[PDB]
Write a protein that binds this DNA or RNA. Structure first.
Ligand SMILES: [Mg+2]
Ligand SMILES: [Mg+2]
Ligand SMILES: [Mg+2]
Ligand SMILES: [Mg+2]
Ligand SMILES: [Mg+2]
Ligand SMILES: [Mg+2]
Ligand SMILES: [Mg+2]
Ligand SMILES: [Mg+2]
Ligand SMILES: [Mg+2]
Ligand SMILES: [Mg+2]
Ligand SMILES: [Mg+2]
Lengths: 100, 127, 110, 95, 287, 52
RNA sequence: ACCUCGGAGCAGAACCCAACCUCCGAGCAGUACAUGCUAAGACUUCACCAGUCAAAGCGAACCUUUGAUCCA
RNA sequence: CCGAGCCUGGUGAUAGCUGGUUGUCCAAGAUAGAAUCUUAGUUCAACUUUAAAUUUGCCCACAGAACCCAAAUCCCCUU
């Protein structure tokens, strides 16, 4: 299957690069990381890849996850591993084009 | 000189004189044309819009209104083309832009509209 | 091959320029090609080794090599690596410098 | 292939290659993707888009095709309105 | 040179002193001795050592790469596609500047070939020369040029300089004769008629916007003015030019050379031109 | 089983596209995008291509 | 009996792998008929063939299991 | 010397099989996946050799790589 992480933490990544291929949601999309139909994580921006642990708040329409979260003790918080791309370059610059 | 059945005089009897093949609106002398070998080169066409007698006065006014961003402080309309390696094609594009501007003079914004509407809504204080 | 016609103004619209008369008094001379162009040629081997050859050199090919190194080191930032074929009278420079060398030889008047 | 023909002593061209591949003069070979016309009703739009594409060959595939064609197929052709005229040459290539 | 003085010093150059240039003669490798003998570079037993490995392109039984790819008409009709050698305005200006092409006379494919500005291969389906806009911005020559194809920008440059350009068709036979007339003259055959363009090419050569040699000359001034207007130059009145006769000279659509009629025989041995007078022959060569 | 059928545009264009419908099911009429016309138009089943 | 593909054992922690082997199911079904067109950048079953993901853009609306070429 | 005579010719049949493959000296040089009427072969890959171009390469300290419910590995600033 040759699945798994393709870009480890700190790796420079260009927009569109696949970060990790997975069958389940082992790693979740963070900032500037999109998900394909097959749960592959790809970079939406050019920058550095970071892996963090973040509180998991499932989408309300996700009935199974909502049931899981409602069956949970009052103090518990779910955590998941998220992959973010810290953008490196700015969106652009203002350049003098003409001195009218 | 040799002449066959397919000679041009036989093919087109109406036009037979030699001078018939060589007998000959924007004033190129009036326009100012410059070329910059900036890969595509650049052609700049500039002409004083106000003193463009070859353009009608209402058309000049409409052009000075619509294309005011392309008018220099000296009142001269400046427009450039950089879409070709050939200064011929760049100048052709500039001239076609001039023609299109004259023709239309003869005959992203959503957020700006919303923010202007909000400015008008905030526009309530009356001295 | 016809001798090029005399033109009132040089360089000619195609950029061609006759060698100056009298020839420069340098220790070396670079003869024009039979088509009356400067004999500076790009060359490529292995698909990645780019070279430029000054081919029809007469006299002090070593003086020419010194001059070429002096002229090209500011452009490269390092002294260019060269081969001096004294037998065939050619100078081979690593890298493409055909346009710069042609202009330089024109300035020297070859 | 035939390295020396029996009538001319020349090297022959494998015409199966000519019927299938386009050679760009610089040395690139272009081809269609296998199955690009087969059972399109059961293929996803992305797969069909991938299959409808003209695709370059490997270095070794290109070398094989070069060996299997003769020098006639590797010449400059100045066709009138060749769609591949711009692709016949490489630009801004470093090594 | 010091090399000739060194020769003066050295012994006589004879057939016993000659040596090939070092690096021009690689040593021959032959399978004798420990290093190159024994298995002689063929390896251990197998097809490759026996010399019977399968044909090029065979992949051991797997369907080969060059066969598993679908057939596509990349090269269908390649040998019937017309080819036109490009002549850029840069190249034309270079030839004129170096005097290899004389602008004071009409420029046709014969003149281009004789000046070695272009190399035409009629056997390789070259149908002539196409004018190419490259170098238009620096073209400053007044020329009367006859080509087979011409881009709009190339025509514009030629006409802006005060010149004339016409697109004239040549069939393969006429093209071969035009490109190399001397071998044709040594063939000892009467000059044949230049054939008309094929039906697909007829509209191109009858269109005035292409300056086709079969186009109505009445429409030429209109097209020239349109190009001048489009590309922002004043159209020069070539009729006022002192070379107007040269600029106007155009060979007949059935004429291969400027001053020679179809049917004539060029006797180069005694510098003569035999002309048929039989009425049937004259009618045929004029038709 | 299912059969592959050729839905042909009712807009007069020669545009046809292939769908799958049950053999026992009635002949198909379906709204679909016409690229030549650049608008959604009706398509009708013309003939059975195969039986899959 | 099997031969291709997919899922699980079978590999504890990137990938790859215990082939042979164990079990299961697929040569599809359902859905939609933009479930379109294009296009940066990537993945990949260790070759190739093939197979995946995809920003931006255009256009409509407002997806969950296989087979090449030739030939017809 | 007949489960199919002998001779000549096609014929230097063909052989993925067996055997052999001749001066001197130096140098670099190792097990490895896929497909295949394929596992006594071959083609691609990997490795290998030569030449060439260029600039980073290997080692790696932290940081980082999942829930279901061990030894180690990956990745890379330094060095
Ligand atoms: Mg060379
Ligand atoms: Mg040895
Ligand atoms: Mg042996
Ligand atoms: Mg072997
Ligand atoms: Mg498995
Ligand atoms: Mg792969
Ligand atoms: Mg017997
Ligand atoms: Mg044998
Ligand atoms: Mg050793
Ligand atoms: Mg088989
Ligand atoms: Mg075998």
């Amino acid at each position: 299957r040759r699945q798994g992480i393709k870009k480890m933490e700190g790796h420079y990544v260009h927009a569109g690069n696949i970060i990790a291929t997975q069958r389940h949601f082992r790693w979740h999309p963070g900032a500037h990381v999109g998900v394909g139909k097959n749960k592959c994580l790809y970079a939406l921006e050019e920058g550095i890849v970071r892996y963090t642990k973040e509180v998991y708040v499932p989408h309300p329409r996700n009935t199974e996850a909502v049931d899981l979260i409602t069956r949970l003790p009052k103090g518990a918080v779910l955590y998941k591993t998220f992959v973010h791309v810290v953008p490196a370059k700015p969106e652009g610059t203002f350049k003098l084009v003409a001195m009218l | 000189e040799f002449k066959s059945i397919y000679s041009l005089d036989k093919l087109y009897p109406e036009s037979q004189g030699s001078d018939t093949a060589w007998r000959v609106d924007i004033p190129l002398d009036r326009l100012t044309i410059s070329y910059c070998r900036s890969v595509n080169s650049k052609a700049e066409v500039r002409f004083h819009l106000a003193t463009a007698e070859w353009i009608a006065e209402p058309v000049r006014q409409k052009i000075a209104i619509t294309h005011k961003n392309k008018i220099n402080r000296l009142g001269e309309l400046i427009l450039t083309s950089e879409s070709s390696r050939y200064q011929f094609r760049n100048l052709a594009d500039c001239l076609q832009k001039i023609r299109d501007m004259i023709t239309e003079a003869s005959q992203k914004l959503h957020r700006i509209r919303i923010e202007n509407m909000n400015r008008e809504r905030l526009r309530q204080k009356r001295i | 091959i016809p001798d090029p016609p005399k033109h009132e103004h040089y360089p000619t619209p195609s950029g061609w320029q006759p060698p100056r008369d009298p020839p420069p008094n340098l220790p070396y001379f670079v003869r024009r090609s039979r088509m009356h162009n400067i004999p500076v040629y790009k060359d490529i081997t292995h698909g990645n080794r780019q070279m430029t050859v000054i081919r029809k050199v007469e006299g002090d090919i070593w003086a020419l090599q010194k001059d070429v190194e002096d002229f090209l080191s500011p452009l490269l930032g390092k002294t260019p690596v060269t081969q001096v074929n004294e037998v065939t009278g050619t100078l081979r420079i690593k890298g493409y410098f055909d346009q710069e060398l042609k202009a330089w030889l024109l300035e020297k008047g070859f | 292939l035939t390295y020396f023909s029996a009538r001319k002593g020349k090297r022959k061209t494998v015409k199966a290659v000519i019927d299938r591949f386009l050679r760009l003069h610089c040395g690139l070979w272009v081809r269609r993707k296998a199955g690009y016309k087969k059972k399109l009703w059961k293929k996803t739009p992305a797969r069909k888009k991938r299959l409808r594409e003209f695709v370059f060959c490997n270095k070794t595939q290109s070398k094989l095709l070069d060996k299997m064609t003769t020098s006639f197929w590797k010449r400059r052709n100045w066709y009138v309105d060749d769609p591949y005229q711009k692709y016949h040459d490489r630009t801004n290539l470093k090594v | 040179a010091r090399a000739l003085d060194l020769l003066r010093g050295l012994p006589r150059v004879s057939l016993a002193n000659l040596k090939p240039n070092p690096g021009s003669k690689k040593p021959e490798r032959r399978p004798r001795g420990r290093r190159r003998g024994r298995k002689c570079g063929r390896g251990h037993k197998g097809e490759r050592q026996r010399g019977t490995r399968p044909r090029l392109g065979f992949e051991g039984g797997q369907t080969p790469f060059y066969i598993r790819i679908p057939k596509y008409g990349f090269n269908e009709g390649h040998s019937f596609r017309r080819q036109y050698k490009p002549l850029s305005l840069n190249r034309l200006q270079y030839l004129i500047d170096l005097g290899r092409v004389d602008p004071s006379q009409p420029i046709d494919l014969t003149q281009l070939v004789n000046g070695r500005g272009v190399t035409i291969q009629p056997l390789k389906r070259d149908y002539g020369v196409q004018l190419v806009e490259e170098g238009a911005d620096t073209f400053t020559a007044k020329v009367n040029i006859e080509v087979q194809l011409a881009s709009e920008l190339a025509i514009a440059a030629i006409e802006k300089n005060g010149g004339v350009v016409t697109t004239a068709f040549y069939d393969p036979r006429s093209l071969d004769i035009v490109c190399k007339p001397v071998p044709f003259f040594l063939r000892g055959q009467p000059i044949p008629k230049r054939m008309l363009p094929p039906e697909e090419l007829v509209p191109y050569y009858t269109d005035a916007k292409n300056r086709g040699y079969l186009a109505d000359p009445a429409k030429f001034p209109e097209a020239r003015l349109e190009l001048a207007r489009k590309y922002g130059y004043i159209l020069p009145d070539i009729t006022k030019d002192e070379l107007f006769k040269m600029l106007c000279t155009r060979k007949d659509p059935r004429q291969i050379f400027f001053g020679l009629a179809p049917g004539w025989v060029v006797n180069m041995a005694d510098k003569k031109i035999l002309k048929p007078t039989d009425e049937n022959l004259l009618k045929y060569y004029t038709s | 089983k299912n059969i592959l059928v050729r839905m042909v545009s009712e807009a007069g264009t020669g545009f046809c596209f292939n769908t799958k419908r049950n053999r026992l099911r009635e002949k198909l009429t379906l709204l679909h995008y016409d690229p030549v016309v650049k608008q959604r138009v009706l398509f009708v089943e013309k003939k059975k291509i195969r039986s899959l």
